[PDB]
């Protein structure tokens, strides 16, 4: 079910966040949901991390030039190739964790690309995208995609 | 779940220095990059990852066909290091994307340098 999947997306995102460190940790983690999505309704209700920090989420436009300073995390929906390039031009050089809802465009762009709809959520990770992100991501995060 | 919060200072091998970059028109690695790759390879195996996809890239200088081949040779050079690090040969997929998917601006020397790369992808 879509609700069931949305909650699973919320949990895997919280899981991934726990393996990430920002060079300047905010009081409130800012998440922007960008582009059409199926599984973000849970995210958008807001979350709390196990370290006590609130995650504030809202939808922002694909063509907002300040995405890189308006969030710590971007959850990227189904956007075409022009839009996708636009988004990552905006993010370049900002310390932003990027996660895409679908798992097919992970050659460039997002650090993590989810696969939702199987018995369990998995993801691909692009280490080059991670290296360029400006945030620290511990390799043991990769265990979340397995088992 | 959220056990990453227990992590301290060890093993953070995916930082800025972990990019796998190549010199202009080069498809071979030098000691700085091969050392970098072995550390990445060891980090992955340490967290029970035994399967990767390697995607090679070029900047946009020259014709498309030449760059397609160059990108494949780059991915092959990285695969060799993964094999020698202990990753099973059959678990390493190699792909060349040529000049088609730049991560940086080809209009600058610095940007072209960033584009000459192999991206290590850890599949689901």
Residue numbers in the entry:
A (entry chain A): 40 to 186
B (entry chain B): 44 to 167
What do the study authors state?
As expected, both mutants form a stable complex with YfiR. Finally, we crystalized YfiR in complex with the YfiBL43P mutant and solved the structure at 1.78 Å resolution by molecular replacement using YfiR and YfiB as models. The YfiB-YfiR complex is a 2:2 heterotetramer in which the YfiR dimer is clamped by two separated YfiBL43P molecules with a total buried surface area of 3161.2 Å2. The YfiR dimer in the complex is identical to the non-oxidized YfiR dimer alone, with only Cys145-Cys152 of the two disulfide bonds well formed, suggesting Cys71-Cys110 disulfide bond formation is not essential for forming YfiB-YfiR complex. The N-terminal structural conformation of YfiBL43P, from the foremost N-terminus to residue D70, is significantly altered compared with that of the apo YfiB. The majority of the α1 helix (residues 34–43) is invisible on the electron density map, and the α2 helix and β1 and β2 strands are rearranged to form a long loop containing two short α-helix turns, thus embracing the YfiR dimer. The YfiB-YfiR interface can be divided into two regions. Region I is formed by numerous main-chain and side-chain hydrophilic interactions between residues E45, G47 and E53 from the N-terminal extended loop of YfiB and residues S57, R60, A89 and H177 from YfiR (Fig. 3D-I(i)). In region II, the side chains of R96, E98 and E157 from YfiB interact with the side chains of E163, S146 and R171 from YfiR, respectively. In the YfiB-YfiR complex, one sulfate ion is found at the bottom of each YfiBL43P molecule and forms a strong hydrogen bond with D102 of YfiBL43P. Similarly, in the YfiR-bound YfiBL43P structure, the sulfate ion interacts with the side-chain atoms of D102 (corresponding to D71 in Pal) and R117 (corresponding to R86 in Pal) and the main-chain amide of N68 (corresponding to D37 in Pal).
